[PDB]
Design a protein around this nucleic acid. Structure first.
Lengths: 200, 60, 130, 187, 138, 142
RNA sequence: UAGGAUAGGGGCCUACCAUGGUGGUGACGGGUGACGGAGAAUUAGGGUUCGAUUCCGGAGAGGGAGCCUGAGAAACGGCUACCACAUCCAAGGAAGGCAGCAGGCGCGCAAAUUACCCAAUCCUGACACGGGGAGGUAGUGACAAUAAAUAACAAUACCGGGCGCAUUAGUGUCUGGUAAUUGGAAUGAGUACAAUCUAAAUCCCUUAACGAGGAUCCAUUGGAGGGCAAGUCUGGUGCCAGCAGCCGCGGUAAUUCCAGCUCCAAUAGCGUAUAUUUAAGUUGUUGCAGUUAAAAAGCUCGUAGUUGGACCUUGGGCCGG
């Protein structure tokens, strides 16, 4: 959430509650848009970037798995990688493709599934690319102890009632498997964004 | 039997001893300071050591 | 019952006697104890007599002692089957203090304490070799 | 959110006497207290607690199998924490000695005994006072605390503080009154 | 550092410094050595200081949160140099402003303040006539 | 003879175990509610008002008048006897004052040598019993 | 099975319909400072005990029922009704609920200020900008706990116990102390310009000027028969007075009393009580006993329940690393 993230930059001493003056003068923008809400839902891959004489940031994970800043390029800031959190499916071409922060993006790609990821720009919300969820792809584990690790998909296991586990080969250690909700694919052979050491 | 005994006899011994207030004598240094002394006294030139250790003996 | 404990108990009292064996009927979890003895060389030989036609199976033992020192100082049971008392690879209670081993039926099969511990697989103790 | 208060958890153990007065125990403890120059058995109890808990952690790693993931990773921390302080000498780094250890090693690394060892005091009782007298320090910022627990790194740095005599400028009150009387009064 | 007299310098040192273009100002730590000496002063700081960073006014700049440690000869606080007088006030909390001289602390009475608002709600109309009404009515 | 070792049979051991505890004094105190039967509620101390000074004779080879006083608790109707320790103190107690009593360290029960005396006197008149005999402090008037 | 209801399935209720459901694996009933949990204490471990508590989830807000508004309340610092309480009045009527915060009474063994601020922690509002006894702020607070002052060191004087010397007498030297003497040092227990700091202040922080001759700037509570560390002290009491958890003592030269002395011993802390954990393998899972000490049912059948044999695509052989 925004308040924690902004404060990480500021923290030398005696700001914090005075975050409010910065927000209301609109010298913080998040994804090119005004939000002054501390309770704002955030996830991995949010872009922060502020007006004019500013900087660009990507949300990353520490050892716990809490949000922290890393500097990111201005070119990369224009783009954002967004999980398709939920889907309204098919006919007449009216998907609501939910994201973690709550952005909707509309209308067919020649695919679309839940747990697949959509590459989006930032301001206009038009579809740069669509990334399929499949084996061999690069993943970040969003939750648990295992957070801040990256690895390549060994296999996905499909079962009755839910598809229980999806297995990741790599880790600092050895293989681990996680739920589909924990898995956020962040790279594919078609389009990766992954060129980052990570977390723990 | 007797459980209805006299109440008359209370406090005889103190009133048959003369009261004596404590005296002024050279004061050992106190708290932390007193504790310092103890190891030096018992281990260097010792004190007494009949049986275990002893201190305020006269006739033995 | 399950035999197991009977073999262990009989073994140590027979050592005090200084007999060269006692010979008895055997079962399948008491096939296991004898083979483990061979590995850790309490036995340098064991023979399973009449396990072919008869009503039972059996095995006369040829057993170490009648030497100088006894090799098996103590073996005493630590619960048969039909019970829940359980150890893991990390839980490890022990007898002896590493001179002996703790008899363990593991997932794959019966192996000694160190083998099971390395593989990181738990199981249920059968007895305490000192 | 708004935070909570303070727990603590035991700093010391006075649990160690089974029997409150043991002649053997009393004699042994008082000798240690005398040599290192502690004032109280309370000061003995806290260091005794520190010894026991540090040892307790070590036992767990070594009893477990070799090349167990906890044993190797945590074992790096276990070795260096003692070694850095100077609690554990090099050569004793077998991990057998970490299990063993002694009470004495902690007291030896304290600042108070270091003052006496490097001359100056002419009594361990005098060494206890000297730190309060503002003498001796690693940097500039006076230690008046005997249980400072020198790293061996900071042992080298021990020389008089910037204030107090032998360190420099001010002598303190007793001379100041004496010289004032001497130069105007004739004593 | 820190200009001398005979009575030693009392070091003017800065440390852990980020210029943050959101708050629009300079935040840094003031770790003041005081070898053989007492308190530097709130004035003596902002009188040196000023001329190094070339803000050249005591008025806009504040130093605060001295606490310290035992053993003496050092104190740690925190101080900031601001890009403008007007800009500074908005970002700053009120507690800095009042001591600096930029603001006055208003003292209030709880009982007077809250009760008075309720009274305003209750009366509708001029209600001067009610005062005369009560006299007649008894 | 030996206890059941068995997967289900756990239940037998558990049920029997609870009954055994009642023999042990500490558990019995809570379980039966013997604490309530004893004159205190469960309290650290309890206060009463002095009915009488009574002179209770010592038991068996000890001969002496112990000198006690009976107090009736403010909380309860229960009358019980409490010992007044120390030289004097029969004078310092007095009828109709408020006395704070505590156990002997016997954890209820009569002490033994003084028949039926379940408690001892910690303080009289709010002062401290300890102070008064010693002559460290003096009783306040009224 | 059907319907109405409500956001919705729903005995949810209600019609019709059938006659079931559930229990020794302890149901049903009663009790419980019985909130639940994360957690806490204490136990090597295993466990035992506890959970009022700045968190997490629910319930209630004097007791009960009922309802409006609104996204949402079966709201209680809203209403409406009754009951129970107390309040005010010009006595006709009317207003109101500190298990919110201060404060006061009562209760009891038991628990603090009718001060101040929205600056931080965080929220709410038409609103950067205000408000919030939430929260912070200071006071009080030995629940607990932490850091650690009350004096140290030389000299010197006898006294040693050393040592080199000691042959030969001796004492002599590093010094252990018994020295209210001495000697210059030094520090904060205290005190106070300066400014710091806190919402603003106090404190923390300091630091000029100050601040020890041991009696002063002086530590205490427990203990000295056993358990239990440390007297067969001195005076007195004399089965009296008390001491004494327990075992015991006191009947006149009491190491157990009562004072003094001296000593022990924790030491800014220590006693005492109740509960609780350990000890206690007195709760026996880990880890019990039943011939005679507490303890096999008179005997057998026999269930629920536990427990239960063996053959059992398993065994063997080869290479690679």
């Amino acid at each position: 959430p925004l308040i924690l993230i902004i404060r990480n930059r500021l923290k030398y001493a005696l700001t914090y509650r005075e975050v409010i003056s910065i927000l209301m003068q609109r010298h913080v923008l998040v994804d090119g848009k005004v939000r002054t809400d501390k309770t704002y839902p955030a996830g991995f891959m949010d872009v922060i970037s502020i007006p004019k004489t500013g900087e660009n940031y990507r949300l990353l994970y520490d050892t716990k798995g809490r949000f922290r800043l890393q500097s990111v390029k201005d070119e990369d800031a224009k783009f954002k990688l967004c999980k398709v959190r939920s889907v309204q499916f098919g006919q007449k071409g009216i998907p609501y493709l939910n994201t973690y922060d709550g952005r909707t993006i509309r209308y067919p790609d020649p695919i679309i599934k839940a747990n697949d990821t959509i590459k989006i720009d930032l301001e206009t919300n038009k579809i740069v690319d669509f990334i399929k969820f499949d084996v061999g792809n690069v993943v970040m584990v969003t939750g648990g102890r295992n957070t801040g690790r990256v690895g390549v998909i060994k296999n996905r296991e499909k079962h009755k009632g839910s598809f229980e586990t999806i297995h990741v080969e790599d880790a600092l250690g050895h293989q681990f498997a996680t739920r589909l909700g924990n898995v956020f694919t962040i790279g594919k052979g078609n389009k990766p964004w992954v060129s980052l050491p990570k977390g723990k | 039997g007797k459980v209805h005994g006299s109440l008359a006899r209370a406090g005889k011994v103190r009133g048959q001893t003369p009261k004596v207030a404590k005296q002024d004598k050279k004061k050992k240094p106190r708290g932390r300071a007193h504790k310092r002394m103890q190891y030096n006294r018992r281990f260097v030139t010792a004190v007494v050591g009949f049986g275990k250790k002893r201190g305020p003996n006269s006739s033995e | 019952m399950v035999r197991v404990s009977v073999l262990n108990d009989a073994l140590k009292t027979m050592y005090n006697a200084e007999k060269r064996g006692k010979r008895q009927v055997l079962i399948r979890p008491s096939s296991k104890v004898i083979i483990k003895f061979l590995i850790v060389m309490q036995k340098h030989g064991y023979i399973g007599e009449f396990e072919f036609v008869d009503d039972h199976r059996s095995g006369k033992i040829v057993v170490e002692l009648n030497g100088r020192l006894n090799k098996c100082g103590v073996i005493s049971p630590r619960f048969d089957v039909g019970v829940k008392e359980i150890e893991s690879w990390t839980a490890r209670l022990l007898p002896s203090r590493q001179f002996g081993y703790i008899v363990l039926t593991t997932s794959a099969g019966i192996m000694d304490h160190e083998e099971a511990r390395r593989k990181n697989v738990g199981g249920k103790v059968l007895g305490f070799f000192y | 959110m708004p935070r909570a208060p303070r727990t603590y958890s035991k700093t010391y153990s006075t649990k160690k006497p089974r029997r409150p007065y043991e002649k053997e125990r009393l004699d042994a403890e008082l000798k240690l207290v005398g040599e290192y120059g502690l004032r109280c058995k309370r000061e003995l109890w806290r260091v005794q607690y520190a010894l026991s808990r540090i040892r307790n952690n070590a036992r767990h790693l070594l009893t477990l199998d070799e090349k167990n993931p906890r044993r190797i990773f945590e074992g790096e921390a276990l070795l260096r924490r003692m070694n850095r302080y100077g609690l554990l000498a090099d050569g004793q780094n077998k991990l057998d000695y970490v299990l063993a250890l002694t009470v004495e090693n902690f007291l030896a690394r304290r600042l108070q005994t270091l003052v006496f060892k490097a001359g100056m005091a002419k009594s361990i009782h005098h060494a206890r006072v000297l730190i309060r007298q503002r003498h001796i320090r690693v940097g500039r910022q006076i230690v008046n605390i005997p249980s400072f627990m020198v790293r061996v790194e900071s042992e080298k740095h021990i020389d008089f503080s910037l204030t107090s005599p032998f360190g420099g400028g001010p002598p303190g009150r007793v001379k100041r009154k004496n010289q004032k009387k001497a130069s105007g009064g004739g004593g | 550092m820190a200009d001398t007299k005979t009575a030693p310098a009392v070091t003017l040192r800065t440390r852990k410094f980020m210029t943050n273009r959101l708050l629009s100002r300079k935040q840094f730590v003031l770790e003041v050595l005081h070898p053989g000496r007492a308190n530097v002063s709130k004035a003596d700081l902002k009188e040196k200081l000023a001329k190094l960073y070339e803000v050249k006014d005591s008025n806009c700049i504040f130093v605060f949160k001295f606490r310290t440690h035992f053993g003496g000869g050092k104190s740690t606080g925190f101080g900031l140099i601001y890009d403008n007088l007007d800009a500074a006030k908005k970002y700053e909390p009120k507690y800095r402003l009042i001591r600096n001289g930029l603001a006055t602390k208003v003292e209030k009475s709880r009982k007077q303040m809250k009760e008075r608002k309720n009274r305003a709600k209750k009366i509708r109309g001029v209600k001067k006539t009610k005062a005369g009404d009560a006299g007649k009515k008894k | 003879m030996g206890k059941t070792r068995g997967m289900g049979a756990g239940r037998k051991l558990k049920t029997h175990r609870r009954n055994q505890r009642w023999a042990d004094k500490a558990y019995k105190k809570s379980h039966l509610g013997n604490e309530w039967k004893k004159p205190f509620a469960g309290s650290s101390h309890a206060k009463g008002i002095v009915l009488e000074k009574i002179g209770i004779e010592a038991k068996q080879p000890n001969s002496a008048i112990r000198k006690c006083a009976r107090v009736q608790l403010v909380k309860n109707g229960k009358k019980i006897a409490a010992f007044v320790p120390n030289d004097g103190c029969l004078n310092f107690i007095e009828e109709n004052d408020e006395v704070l009593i505590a156990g002997f360290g016997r954890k209820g029960h009569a002490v033994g040598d003084i028949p039926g005396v379940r408690f001892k006197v910690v303080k009289v008149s709010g002062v401290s019993l300890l102070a008064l005999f010693k002559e460290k402090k003096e009783k306040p008037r009224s």
